[PDB]
Amino acid sequence: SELLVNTKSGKVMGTRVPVLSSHISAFLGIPFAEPPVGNMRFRRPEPKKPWSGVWNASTYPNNCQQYVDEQFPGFSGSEMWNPNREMSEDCLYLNIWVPSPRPKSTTVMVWIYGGGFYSGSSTLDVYNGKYLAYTEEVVLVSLSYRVGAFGFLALHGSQEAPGNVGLLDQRMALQWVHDNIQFFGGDPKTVTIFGESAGGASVGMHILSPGSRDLFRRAILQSGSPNCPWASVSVAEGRRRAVELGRNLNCNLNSDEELIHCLREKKPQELIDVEWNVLPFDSIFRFSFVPVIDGEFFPTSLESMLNSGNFKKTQILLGVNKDEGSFFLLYGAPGFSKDSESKISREDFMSGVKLSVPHANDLGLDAVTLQYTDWMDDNNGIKNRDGLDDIVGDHNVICPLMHFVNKYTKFGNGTYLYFFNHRASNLVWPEWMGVIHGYEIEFVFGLPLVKELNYTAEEEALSRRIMHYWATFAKTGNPNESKWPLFTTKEQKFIDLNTEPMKVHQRLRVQMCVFWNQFLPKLLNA
Amino acid sequence: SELLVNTKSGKVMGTRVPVLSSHISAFLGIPFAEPPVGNMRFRRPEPKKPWSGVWNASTYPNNCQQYVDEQFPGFSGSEMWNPNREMSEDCLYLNIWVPSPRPKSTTVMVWIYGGGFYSGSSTLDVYNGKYLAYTEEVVLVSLSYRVGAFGFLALHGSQEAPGNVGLLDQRMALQWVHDNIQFFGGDPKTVTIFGESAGGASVGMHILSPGSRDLFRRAILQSGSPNCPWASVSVAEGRRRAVELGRNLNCNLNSDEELIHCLREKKPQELIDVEWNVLPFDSIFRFSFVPVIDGEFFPTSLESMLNSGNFKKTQILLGVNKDEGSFFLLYGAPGFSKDSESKISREDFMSGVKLSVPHANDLGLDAVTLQYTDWMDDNNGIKNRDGLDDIVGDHNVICPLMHFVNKYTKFGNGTYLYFFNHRASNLVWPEWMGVIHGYEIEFVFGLPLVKELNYTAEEEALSRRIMHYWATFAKTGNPNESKWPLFTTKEQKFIDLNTEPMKVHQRLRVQMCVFWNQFLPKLLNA
Numbered sequence A, B: 001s002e003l004l005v006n007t008k009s010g011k012v013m014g015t016r017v018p019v020l021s022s023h024i025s026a027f028l029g030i031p032f033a034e035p036p037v038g039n040m041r042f043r044r045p046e047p048k049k050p051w052s053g054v055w056n057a058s059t060y061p062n063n064c065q066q067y068v069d070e071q072f073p074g075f076s077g078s079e080m081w082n083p084n085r086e087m088s089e090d091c092l093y094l095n096i097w098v099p100s101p102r103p104k105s106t107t108v109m110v111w112i113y114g115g116g117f118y119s120g121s122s123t124l125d126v127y128n129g130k131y132l133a134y135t136e137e138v139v140l141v142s143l144s145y146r147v148g149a150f151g152f153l154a155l156h157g158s159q160e161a162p163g164n165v166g167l168l169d170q171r172m173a174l175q176w177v178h179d180n181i182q183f184f185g186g187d188p189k190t191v192t193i194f195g196e197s198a199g200g201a202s203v204g205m206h207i208l209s210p211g212s213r214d215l216f217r218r219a220i221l222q223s224g225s226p227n228c229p230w231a232s233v234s235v236a237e238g239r240r241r242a243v244e245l246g247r248n249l250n251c252n253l254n255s256d257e258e259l260i261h262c263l264r265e266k267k268p269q270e271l272i273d274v275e276w277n278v279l280p281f282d283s284i285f286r287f288s289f290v291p292v293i294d295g296e297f298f299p300t301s302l303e304s305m306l307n308s309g310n311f312k313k314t315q316i317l318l319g320v321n322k323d324e325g326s327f328f329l330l331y332g333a334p335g336f337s338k339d340s341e342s343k344i345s346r347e348d349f350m351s352g353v354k355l356s357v358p359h360a361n362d363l364g365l366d367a368v369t370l371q372y373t374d375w376m377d378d379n380n381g382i383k384n385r386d387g388l389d390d391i392v393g394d395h396n397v398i399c400p401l402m403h404f405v406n407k408y409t410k411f412g413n414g415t416y417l418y419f420f421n422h423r424a425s426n427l428v429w430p431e432w433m434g435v436i437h438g439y440e441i442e443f444v445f446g447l448p449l450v451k452e453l454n455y456t457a458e459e460e461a462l463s464r465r466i467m468h469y470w471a472t473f474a475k476t477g478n479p480n481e482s483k484w485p486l487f488t489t490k491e492q493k494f495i496d497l498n499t500e501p502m503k504v505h506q507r508l509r510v511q512m513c514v515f516w517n518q519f520l521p522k523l524l525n526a
Ligand SMILES: *O[C@](O)(c1cccc([N+](C)(C)C)c1)C(F)(F)F
Pocket: A081, A114, A115, A116, A117, A196, A197, A198, A199, A223, A224, A437, A438
């Protein structure tokens, strides 16, 4: 029956989920790696030992152990992103939504979620692959990975806790998809990995790491690149933040293995509790345990690789939302509040920019300000609120992406770039926040298709328009069946994505990105 | 008779010059210092020994020895500025245009001409004080000073050739005006010194030098400040450029006096010939023999003085033309030509900016470019032509002036700032050049009043409008009898000066001036 399936690891019993007027089959929580509990914590994942009997794949698996956002309790805007299941170290599971009837072999899309590498869940409402699967006849898969210390603690010298262990979980799920998606109807030759934020930056890491390239065909990255300032740390930094977390729990730091044993004994929440006390600076949009450039997962520095075309050459579809900074400012910058216009004083703006460029020396701070402040209006509540938003977005998402784009277009097999600039009519976040980072996701996964969600018809439209552009690109390497042009180092065309007729622009944030990508760094070495 | 006059130095016989329908009296070429010829070359000026008999003051005196501009022969645009008389070391003379009938005591305006301190003449057509004298019932005086090596050679240690000797000539003429203008009808208590370019920057130097403050009441500075990058050099620099000129003439450089004797023997043109070979860098808008900060004429560095309110506190009227760079680019920058649109390649633009910021290190050059280039149009002939114009103007006239303005408004007794942005209908220079530095002068001196000069009526209007604003300010300390507001460090209001209704703006080139006045210098010390 459509619901019962035989895979190399065993047979799994699925479920038939209703979607819109019809139905679809969902296989939820298929394990793909041995439960990283016990002395296997921090260790790399093992492959799932084959099972006896049918594996009931009808319900969502536990979420990984992580930091829950309590700032705005009851607030949907803040909670849609929170673990909707029992957090547990045994969280390495995978989910698949297959059309009905099940296909012969069709395009597969593996979704990798974001969360600053400190949070994330595959089981959450805005990640329901069903509308996309059903609407575009596609096999949607969502995987899970160890976030935080659990997935990214990095005591390089050791084998008991090397870094990127959580980036390896992504890989091992990609493997299983590769080895078994045929039994579900997917073409293992046409598997597209798409992700957002840390997900989209993870996506770009698999395009880079030699060991992952062969396991997928093409990539979609939304608001994130592996070259982002918050996505990677040196083996060194990873070492220190490792011991810092060590001090915080009163661990014998004298011996790497005694440090590892201590950490391996502490309950999970004890780790999550002080997770943030280890960052080395007062700063916003920066996280604790992130991937390291270890020479294994990454044979070399990312810029070297980017420079020398040392990466999988395929076609990529990458984008960036309009207001990338908001969320981050409203969370860690003094001045921004949910219930107000967050007009900013120049006393706050100055500390805002200190928090955004944590590496900046005085002159660095000085140059950032010269670029972002209106001298015809030194202190303007609004002007500084927005100017700060752009400082965060440009430096943390836009400029790094545009860099990866330009460096990659030279060796890749076709690139498509977009600019999502549309605030959902039903958005629950304050208007000043605008087109918030993370709010295109819902359009991509087709939420506007459900009436009971209160979106305008123009939005149902833009959802179908996007979902297609997406699916169509997965199957083909070109979003086109409008007429989305190709990004080219020469013209640098890109397009807006909103409910208005598709316009084609050029040079996204070129002015500001030469400052961030070329000037600032050159200045900072003096 | 109106024409015969008795002054402390002797009696002078004048002339009656016709002006418009009427007539006026002109006294041309009254000496005010002993002829700086002979071993007095480079020495400071002596006062004119009183004369026997009447001094016939009916014709223009010789012009000082200087560099004649031959680039555009026959071209009016280029020659209106050239010596119209016999150049001669015996050029220390003064001119006075008195109304008819001669007044009791009325406002005096002493005009100090510009020319990068390397050129200038009092006797030239656009400096005819007659229209202004006659129209506003004012006593107009024009003085002369030794330009170039003759007036500014600076071997500090020596008394035989200390610097600023040519700035002392200005002073001694100011003295004579002070001691004798009453016999001509002028109120020695109401004497306004106005100047343009090096003249206007000389004006600001007398506001600064303790020794000059008491000799004049108020100041008008047009396109120049003493704090301009080309207006002053260290005692040191003056020494080296002194010996460089020494090498160039094969002088015994071993002894300061042997160096001075050699120079004092060489004919004048021999000095003018190699005048330019001594500058220490490839650069535009920079001159050879300029005033030095010697501790005498200037008790201290200009910025110290500016900072500590160490300057004559009166009211000043200062301005800046729209296109301040043109002239300089079209003369020393590769790419600009008189007969073409001078669209600039980015290969020329880059050498343009190297020529403008001769002190800039790579990063300096890099920051200047980030600020002045349109990234949405990297190479655009026009864009770069204009962007280069602004680089020159801002860095060489606008920003230094705005700085002096802001620093002075804090201690001064009233400041009025303007922005001349009007291209004369009959302008002979190419249009790209726009509102050229030096082309307001003609409006101030009332040329548009003569029909045979082909100006529009709107221009006759703007000429009378300006001449009044000027005269009225001399007599009162306020240009107002429209409504030109006061410059204030807070509001920073200023107004446009053209044939359209007077508009009041704010913050002239604020954006760019914080880069030039604050950022660039801070960056450059790293
Ligand atoms: O992961 C991001 O895109 C990110 C950070 C924090 C929170 C979210 N979400 C709310 C879950 C979408 C996304 C980051 F860190 F790279 F910006």
